[PDB]
Amino acid sequence: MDPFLVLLGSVSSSLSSSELTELKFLCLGRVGKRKLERVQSGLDLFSMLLEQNDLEPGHTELLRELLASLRRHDLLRRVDDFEA
Amino acid sequence: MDFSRNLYDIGEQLDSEDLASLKFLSLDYIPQRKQEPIKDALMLFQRLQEKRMLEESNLSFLKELLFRINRLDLLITYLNTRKEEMERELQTPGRAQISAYRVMLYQISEEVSRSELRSFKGGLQEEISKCKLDDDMNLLDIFIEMEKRVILGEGKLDILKRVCAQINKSLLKIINDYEEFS
Amino acid sequence: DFSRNLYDIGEQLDSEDLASLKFLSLDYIPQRKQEPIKDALMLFQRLQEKRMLEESNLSFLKELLFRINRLDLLITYLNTRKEEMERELQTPGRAQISAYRVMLYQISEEVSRSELRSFKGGLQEEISKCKLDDDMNLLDIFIEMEKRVILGEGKLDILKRVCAQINKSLLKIINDYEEF
Amino acid sequence: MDFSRNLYDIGEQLDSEDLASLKFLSLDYIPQRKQEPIKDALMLFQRLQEKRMLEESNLSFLKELLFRINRLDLLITYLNTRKEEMERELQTPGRAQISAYRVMLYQISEEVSRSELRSFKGGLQEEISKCKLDDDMNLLDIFIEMEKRVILGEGKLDILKRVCAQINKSLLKIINDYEEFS
Amino acid sequence: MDFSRNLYDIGEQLDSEDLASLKFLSLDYIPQRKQEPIKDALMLFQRLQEKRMLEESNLSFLKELLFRINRLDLLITYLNTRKEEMERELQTPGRAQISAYRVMLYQISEEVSRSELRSFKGGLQEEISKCKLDDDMNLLDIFIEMEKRVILGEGKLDILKRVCAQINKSLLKIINDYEEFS
Amino acid sequence: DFSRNLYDIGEQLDSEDLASLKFLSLDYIPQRKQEPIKDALMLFQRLQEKRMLEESNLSFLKELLFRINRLDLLITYLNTRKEEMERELQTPGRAQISAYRVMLYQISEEVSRSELRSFKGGLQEEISKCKLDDDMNLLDIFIEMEKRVILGEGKLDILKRVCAQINKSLLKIINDYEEFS
Amino acid sequence: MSAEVIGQVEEALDTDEKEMLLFLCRDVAIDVVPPNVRDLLDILRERGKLSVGDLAELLYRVRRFDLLKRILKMDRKAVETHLLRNPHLVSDYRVLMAEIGEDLDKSDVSSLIFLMKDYMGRGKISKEKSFLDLVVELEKLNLVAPDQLDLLEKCLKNIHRIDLKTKIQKYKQSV
Amino acid sequence: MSAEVIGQVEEALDTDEKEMLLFLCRDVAIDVVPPNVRDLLDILRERGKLSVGDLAELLYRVRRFDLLKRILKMDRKAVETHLLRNPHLVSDYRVLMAEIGEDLDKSDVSSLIFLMKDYMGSKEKSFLDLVVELEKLNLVAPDQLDLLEKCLKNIHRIDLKTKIQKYKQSV
Amino acid sequence: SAEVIGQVEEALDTDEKEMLLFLCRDVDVVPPNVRDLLDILRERGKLSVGDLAELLYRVRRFDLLKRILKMDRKAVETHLLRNPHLVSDYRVLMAEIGEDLDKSDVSSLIFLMKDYMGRGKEKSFLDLVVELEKLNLVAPDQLDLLEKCLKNIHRIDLKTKIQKYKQSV
Amino acid sequence: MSAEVIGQVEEALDTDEKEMLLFLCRDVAIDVVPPNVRDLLDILRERGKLSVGDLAELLYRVRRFDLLKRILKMDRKAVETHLLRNPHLVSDYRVLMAEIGEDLDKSDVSSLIFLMKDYMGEKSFLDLVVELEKLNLVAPDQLDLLEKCLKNIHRIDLKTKIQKYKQSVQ
């Protein structure tokens, strides 16, 4: 699943600290407060979601929903290009 | 209905001025140390979620907050609440979670301009230190400093009345209406 | 090439043009995301994040620079003339800014300083004095009216009521938008 | 009882500015090495509890601290001490645990603004290095650096008088009042 | 006096910045391997006690250290040594134990701010790897890395002058004043 | 005074420099003997046991101290200048540390802390989580990759992948090492 | 079940997950203090208390469904049906404690420790301790128990964490 | 009382609790120095000094009330009444030393060791190890606490000085 | 020469002695230490100068080759290339695998092996190999179990060493 | 005083204290090298070299005053007056070696062994001193090598201790 990992890494690299805090707030229902405090990048949160099967390479619904919330349609296009 | 995403959109429609107003209106429930890092709406919501004052089944305090800051657009769009409804809900005794003393103070800030704020600061030279009378302070911060110095409160409106009597009379109208309402 | 071009376009825009562009982009960028936008380039960045401005899609940037009447930048950096834009905006499609927004902005183009004072004084019944301060322009007043649900696509009553006192040419634009 | 709960509630009503002020006011009892990691009010309390200056039976120093930072609201609410009482308690010779030299300095920080602080820094170029005169330093850190370089002290107020006279005359009034009591 | 208690009190009045300054000023006497675990002043003292440079009868190096870091308060309080006195003692040839080359470098660190330090780091990208130019490094660590790469030294001040000439002009004056004494 | 010189060189060596030296000596000192190396003198002794460091053979020590960019120690205790080392290491064959090692070490020299975090995240599927702790450095990750025969002199695909994920200068370093072969 | 499965589980956990796994099994291994997770799982396997279903339950409590699918070849339905059909290895009290710990950040745990020093003292203070370390200390002092949660509830209420108080009340009503 | 109880106690204590338990029993195991806790308990039972009440007092001093309830089936008041009834196995001096040690972090213990090196001639040791070293040099004792008191005052730990003063006044 | 054996035994650490004892396991009675083993070997005539040189080469003590036997790496390497070895390649492979394992890897490897053997004390990899030999679990013609266990601890390089050895036979 | 006294001393001593006692008594009985402390004390008692004063000096040198008070009913002042009045069992050279060992950590001893191994051929400093004595490298009249090695490990305080011993000799 190396392409999915590189997709998650690219999405994480294209995020800001404020966007990271927004994603943390959005994922508070799925990830605890302490684990969210341990998150220092988008890839950390994506890895935690991948360990919980909330985000799979064949089930990108959560990632697309999070990116649609943040209105990051370019990252949505990246995800769609991955789906190809 | 995604509760978290709805809160995120509401926060996305709020600038720093509305955030400062909401933080002031939530002073009776969130202490100064917890309020200092609040630089966005989301974090504020989080604190309210920790006090069980904001959940998917209890939107009363969020509606009250957005109504007091006159964000009726957010109420109608994301909370499905019109202007009249909240009014009736706030006419019932006990259903108001924001104290009438707080709202009154905020309403005073609604009627003060820039030069009026400068005059309000000049009127407090002999009661408040100059470090708290800087030009970067807004009227709510001045109210907070007065409360810290036990100069403003529910039982101490004398200095507020005096300073308001120097700039405009509608401010005394609001103060005395809240006072007689007690 | 392209990023340098966007940087040059942003460098050729002053604060008034920036405020006009931020108002014209309200239907796609919320208030919180607009607050830190203190230069044109930053605005462009946000548009690039919503896929409304890319190297292959310059339509929205052209529309913005045409609506703000900055034809010099269009001709210099985008190689686009006035007639071209007119033809592009005459199509029923290809318009990304809502007709309600443009109309409102056009009203701000036709009001003077004393007219702005009269507009401020005409709204003391529904808006507080702190939002009707002597430094607010007409776009901020429009935003506050929308916040207090007195101005909108379906509520133009107070807009016409206040516009009729100052001048009648504004009602012309309002009725032209209405016939759409 | 809930002594620690009361201390926690008092700390929750204190922001970072109040914490810096309290740390400055406790300099004569907590050395620099112990002051560096103090990043919240509770920590400070801990150090005081180690010197027996904060106990369930000894609130005198805590009351003095909360009075000197003009947090009279906390005094009245959590310590059941009004402003007048504290005044009386600080007029008796020997009951003041914070030195009159220290308090005076803090009061100067109450009357200096941003431009006044930068002028104060510009007045100390030939006595303090640039790294210690950075634009992020406040007036209390400047006082601390001056004490480190033995230009400010109980028996040496000349340089302080010089810079204050270049900036304002009310600061000379505060200095001269502290001197006349001495 | 009581020597251990005096050293302990001196160390308690020193924060981590003073400790880093002292460790830098003691590089010519304490090697890197022994310098790495030094996380408090007392440890440093112990190492000096192992080289007989700090004992109950030999405070000269300790006085010089506390003088170079401009801690005259500790000098007068715990070592009973005035500011002028040290000057005299340090003007005698060969009485100074800290080299003029070392002190000079430290003085440069006193005249560089945070943004100036960032520009200094940006000025050495072609000569030092990125892992050693992280934002955690202070100017003294950059000097140490430059010495490791033999670009900074007593006879090799060319790159130092080059980098200093782009951030500030007084640093070139300090460098040339140290240079003319050679 | 050879032992005194070795002791003085070791006293001027930090723990990070020691880890770098241990990594650059991996092709000659195995992991079991390398684990207890918590001082420079121990590394020196181990090299003396393989006859790679003697009173007359300082070549490997000079190469090590040059690769860690400790030119001060080279000039002061080993009496060798930087240009001299450059010349001697430009000759084809006198290099005892492989170009693969030097390349890896330079990559570790050009990666920052956040870059190291992204590196660890990019190797989640290939390395067990317990080995991707925040205390692991990039060289330990390289060693873990070599353990799984995913990094090597002829195998650079995953290394290039992660480097392209993080930075382009690392790809340039890899390609410079490759054109040397 | 084999040593390879235990090794795979142990190698795919971080320090915090290991600490949580050790905490959850404190009531099934009271007759031993396991030093690490590998020894804990080995002890559970020797005593017959680490079947495939028990390890699945442990992985479910740490929400490592990737490990459930990859190592034990199980999904959510399998582990949930196993927990519905058989008695649990970890009581709901330990799950509640772990949940409360997951919903507390560093500052919250620090403030919680500050409230406890009136009723227990500073205690173990060599390092910054997690919420589970505080729970272990309170258990060793007979201050918290499945039938004794009033103190933790009051302390969580005092740090303005009413949601965790509601979790405690929900657990109380579940009995 | 049996040997299974000793085994359960030995297997249910952590390293710090074992180290403290060995320190508290230093005044009853003087002729012999027990290597570990199990051997100490075996010696105490061999000498008849490990009854149910003695082991209960030991668990009470190491603050392991969970073991008191689970293994000896006792509560806090029961052990307190036992301590009020019979003479104690562990003197108040050892309890004071252990309490002061429990309220000291690594930095405080390091600074305290730095001050003591003037009166006594290399690894990170706990406070109880320092107390043992001072005892081996006749520098601290139930009737000799002035040095430890002064050193605790000099490290700005006045609360522990007050604990020492309370112990001195209770005698 | 017999005076050399005493010097060799004196100038060796515990790990090198244990490894040396392991390599000579294939040549009756079990000698207690290295001195007695070397005495028995040179008594039976199976320990010439070249054999001791090979032994010192396997424990990687070239300084001893220089000081005591006055030989370098090249001489013993050509000697091993030209005549048959005293220590089989299986023992050399085991020693190499042991030297390329850290304490954590050795611990994890022992943890995997305890399913197939008992509980042997902090023992090295060579002690584990000796126990597995005593239990008929590893042998020059039976490396599948050790190879599988090395694969499970992500030591594919050592698995490749085992595969290379199996290819050479 | 009896065999019970020897048993109590052997049982109460620490491991480092036992090793130090053996090192300090290495110069008394060289016919036999005692393996442990119990055998050493038994040999001393048999040879008549374990009086009250001898055991008092031994416990004093290992800095074990609690045992002096508990077993021999003596304080520091008594043993010091005895050492000033009567001849010593342990020479000042052994005491100097033990003091230097007590002021050396494991890294210091490691670097010292690394420097010393050129002149000879995890050990404690006392084991290194014993080997150096068996190789005629250190002696009460031969301390220049150890002194310079301590100077090279930047331990000038121990060099001054050695200088103080040399001044104490003449």
Author numbering:
A (entry chain L): 1 to 84
B (entry chain D), D (entry chain C), E (entry chain B): 1 to 182
C (entry chain E): 2 to 181
F (entry chain A): 2 to 182
G (entry chain K): 1 to 175
H (entry chain J): 1 to 121, 126 to 175
I (entry chain H): 2 to 28, 31 to 123, 127 to 175
J (entry chain I): 1 to 121, 128 to 176
Copy text verbatim from the article accompanying this structure deposition.
Fas-associated protein with death domain (FADD), procaspase-8, and cellular FLICE-inhibitory proteins (cFLIP) assemble through death-effector domains (DEDs), directing death receptor signaling towards cell survival or apoptosis. In this work, we present the crystal and cryo-EM structures of ternary FADD-Casp-8-cFLIP DED complexes, unveiling FADD-FADD, FADD-Casp-8, FADD-cFLIP, Casp-8-cFLIP, and cFLIP-cFLIP DED assemblies in a complex. The atomic coordinates depict how FADDDED and Casp-8tDED could assemble a helical 1:5 and 3:3 intermediate complexes, and how these FADD-Casp-8 intermediate complexes are targeted and capped by four cFLIPtDED molecules. The resultant helical Casp-8tDED-cFLIPtDED hetero-double layer appears to locally activate Casp-8.
We successfully reconstituted the ternary complex FADDFuL_H9G-Casp-8tDED_F122G/L123G-cFLIPtDED_H7G complex, henceforth referred to as the FAFuL_H9G-C8FGLG-CFH7G complex. Subsequently, we obtained the protein crystals and determined the crystal structure at 3.1 Å resolution using the MR-SAD method, in which FADD DD is not visible. Notably, the crystal structure reveals a 1:5:4 stoichiometry for the FAFuL_H9G-C8FGLG-CFH7G complex. This complex represents a single-FADD ternary DED complex, which fits the corresponding SAXS envelope. The single-FADD complex structure unveils additional FADDDED-Casp-8tDED assembly, in which Casp-8tDED assembles a type III-II-III CSS-mediated pentamer, containing Casp-8tDED molecules C8a, C8b, C8c, C8d, and C8e. Although the only FADDDED molecule FAl uses distinct surfaces to interact with three different Casp-8tDED molecules C8a, C8d, and C8e, these interfaces are too small, which are ~330 to ~500 Å2, to form 1:1 FADD-Casp-8 complexes for intermediate complex formation. Instead, the III-II-III CSS contributes larger interface areas, which are ~780 to ~820 Å2 corresponding to the buried surface area (the BSA) of ~1560 to ~1640 Å2, providing Casp-8tDED the ability to self-assemble transient oligomers. These oligomers then form a composite-binding site (CBS) with a larger interface area of 835 ~ 1,280 Å2 to interact effectively with FADD, promoting the formation of a FADD-Casp-8 intermediate complex. In the 1:5:4 FAFuL_H9G-C8FGLG-CFH7G complex structure, three Casp-8tDED molecules C8c, C8d, and C8a provide, respectively, a type Ia, a type IIa, and a type IIIa surfaces, while FADDDED molecule FAl provides a type IIa and a type IIIa surfaces to complete the CBS to recruit cFLIPtDED_H7G molecule CFk.
